[PDB]
């Protein structure tokens, strides 16, 4: 089992780990986490110890400070660890080893960190001339999946043309054989579960010369 864990950047991940003790577990209580970032392809790197009644906690520089264990007695059986503000580079695998022999269990998780959709550009992709095919572009900059989009139209009638109602919540639309009419100024508003992003565009639909 791969536990899914999902935050926002800037807010802190709990990774829980708790664990009974057989009374047979006579050996020193030892524990390890270790991360295997997306970003590169370095693997099962040790972020944090507890071993000898002891916490090290010196390991992993781009976790430095951020990384502590959960409880105040992870002796009486939680291992879990907090990652504090949240970087998208903490994206990974973390996994907790906990050992007191003979007894050994492992656990991992698959943390994900979102960012709300950001940088979004409104954009005419192609001449806008009556006849034309040309495209209404939102494109943000950042953004975690699942996106979702809506178009408007903010000027005039305030209403979107007919033609273009079946991809309103979609990020790109294919205008054929443009109008005129179909000038004016739209909005794209972008979100996610994290929050929202929105541009403009003036869209002005002349004759082709």
């Known amino acids: ?11 802190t991940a709990y990774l829980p780990c708790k664990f009974t003790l057989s009374p047979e577990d006579q050996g020193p209580l030892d524990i390890e ?18 071993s000898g009644d002891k916490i090290y906690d010196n390991y992993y520089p781009d976790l430095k400070g951020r990384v502590h264990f ?16 949240l970087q998208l ?5 973390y996994q907790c080893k906990v050992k007191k022999a003979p007894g050994v269990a492992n656990k991992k998780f698959l943390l994900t960190v ?10 005419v992709d192609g001449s806008e001339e009556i006849g034309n095919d040309f495209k209404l572009k939102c494109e943000p900059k950042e953004g975690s999946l699942p996106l979702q989009f809506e178009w408007q139209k903010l000027s005039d009638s305030q209403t979107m043309p007919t ?30 579960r994290v929050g929202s992003d929105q541009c403009m565009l003036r ?3 002349v004759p082709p010369s």
């Open 114 to 123: 979102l960012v709300k959709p950001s940088g979004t550009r409104c954009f």
């Open 70 to 85: 959960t409880s105040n007695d992870v002796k009486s059986g939680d291992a879990s660890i907090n990652v504090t503000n």
């Open 163 to 192: 033609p273009w109602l079946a991809e309103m919540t979609s990020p790109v639309i294919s205008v054929k054989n443009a109008s005129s009419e179909y000038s004016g100024t739209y909005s794209c508003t972008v979100q996610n």
């Open 89 to 93: 580079s903490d994206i990974g695998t």
């Open 1 to 11: 089992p791969e536990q899914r864990i999902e935050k926002a950047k800037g807010e």
């Open 33 to 50: 986490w270790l991360i295997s970032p997306s970003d590169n392809q370095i693997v099962d790197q040790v972020i944090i110890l507890y």
């Open 203 to 205: 869209l002005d639909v």
